[PDB]
Design a protein around this ligand. Structure first.
Ligand SMILES: O=S(=O)(O)c1cc2c(O)c(c1)Sc1cc(S(=O)(=O)O)cc(c1O)Sc1cc(S(=O)(=O)O)cc(c1O)Sc1cc(S(=O)(=O)O)cc(c1O)S2
Ligand SMILES: O=S(=O)(O)c1cc2c(O)c(c1)Sc1cc(S(=O)(=O)O)cc(c1O)Sc1cc(S(=O)(=O)O)cc(c1O)Sc1cc(S(=O)(=O)O)cc(c1O)S2
Ligand SMILES: O=S(=O)(O)c1cc2c(O)c(c1)Sc1cc(S(=O)(=O)O)cc(c1O)Sc1cc(S(=O)(=O)O)cc(c1O)Sc1cc(S(=O)(=O)O)cc(c1O)S2
Ligand code: HEC
Ligand code: HEC
Lengths: 108, 108
């Protein structure tokens, strides 16, 4: 994947309408169906404190960056087989770019 | 992974010592053990004319770019499970960057 910075505004709206049902981003924000995502970039997968991950999420042991996050979000189950994240994926490169542009700033 | 442009000259040495046994780069070059790699960037995996890939490499259908190339070369069997490319991986990040710098130029 080739992440390129897009519209953080449109990405905020994508997060709100497709991810917020299971995730928060803010420092200290609640765990819900999925883990709070503060600090996700530059951390290995499966390490938010207080959350119970699948073994596959921890064991994939990917160091998240803008590029492997784009590949993951295209089809989560294909990048992390066995993940309990119920999400088919964002197929459009432009939507992933916008969303990841937002995530990069909102999760710090 | 995050590609960062490096030294084409060092990349060329890395290709000769670590890849040339199994691959060539020139247009019309021979399939040795692995496919000739001319045109690899911006093409999906498993498409070099005349080579017989594993089903795994074809099904992967990755659109090759500098970032997923670096991730692949770090550990090919992790990125394309089932591949017949017998190569443990290039663990040094600078070597990956240099080699991809060379590959982008030499496969065109
Ligand atoms: O995520 S969105 O809500 O935005 C979304 C956008 C599009 C869309 O059709 C859908 C959902 S609906 C859908 C849902 C699921 S799933 O949820 O069950 O997995 C699987 C499929 C599927 O069709 S099959 C399929 C899978 C993939 S892949 O997974 O990316 O390899 C690519 C294409 C394709 O047909 S082709 C293709 C290529 C592009 S482009 O922009 O990359 O050129 C865009 C689209 C394509 O269909 S529009
Ligand atoms: O901007 S770049 O970083 O890409 C870059 C471009 C060039 C360059 O010199 C360098 C760095 S500096 C350099 C780097 C490395 S290293 O990084 O590999 O350790 C080893 C050496 C070296 O001098 S020693 C050496 C060994 C041989 S050999 O005995 O024939 O193998 C030929 C040449 C040579 O200098 S001459 C030669 C050969 C080539 S080539 O790649 O077409 O073979 C290119 C050039 C040459 O001057 S331009
Ligand atoms: O380039 S070479 O392929 O010749 C090569 C270079 C280095 C090296 O140790 C080896 C081979 S030997 C080796 C072989 C195998 S294998 O046989 O199972 O494949 C597994 C490992 C292993 O260590 S374990 C391991 C795996 C990875 S990862 O796979 O990249 O995540 C990173 C590191 C690490 O320890 S840490 C690490 C980080 C860097 S840096 O430059 O990126 O900072 C460099 C090195 C590191 O060890 S030097
Ligand atoms: C409920 C149906 C979810 C939706 C919608 C989204 N996510 Fe998700 N996510 C969910 C769960 C239950 C988990 C844990 C999965 C496991 O196997 O343990 C996750 C995980 C992630 C991760 C990895 C977190 C980490 O490694 O620490 C990421 C990066 C992630 N989720 C991102 C994400 C995005 C960007 C979403 C909108 C496109 C999204 N998720 C939606 C549950 C659900
Ligand atoms: C023999 C021991 C090999 C070594 C050394 C290298 N490669 Fe390889 N490669 C090899 C095979 C048999 C295959 C086909 C694998 C399959 O499952 O069909 C490949 C494939 C690749 C690819 C993908 C090709 C494509 O999708 O068209 C790439 C990008 C690739 N090889 C790169 C590569 C590099 C950079 C190497 C040096 C670090 C290297 N290979 C060494 C066999 C062998």
């Amino acid at each position: 994947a080739e992440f390129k910075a897009g519209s953080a505004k449109k990405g905020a709206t994508l997060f709100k309408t497709r991810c917020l049902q299971c995730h928060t981003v803010e420092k200290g924000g609640p765990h819900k169906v999925g883990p709070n995502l503060h600090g996700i970039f530059g951390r290995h997968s499966g390490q938010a404190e207080g959350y119970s991950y699948t073994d596959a999420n921890i064991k994939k042991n990917v160091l998240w960056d803008e590029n492997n996050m784009s590949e993951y979000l295209t089809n989560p189950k294909k990048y992390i087989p066995g993940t309990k994240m119920a999400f088919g994926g964002l197929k459009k490169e432009k939507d992933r770019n916008d969303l990841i542009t937002y995530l990069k700033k909102a999760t710090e």
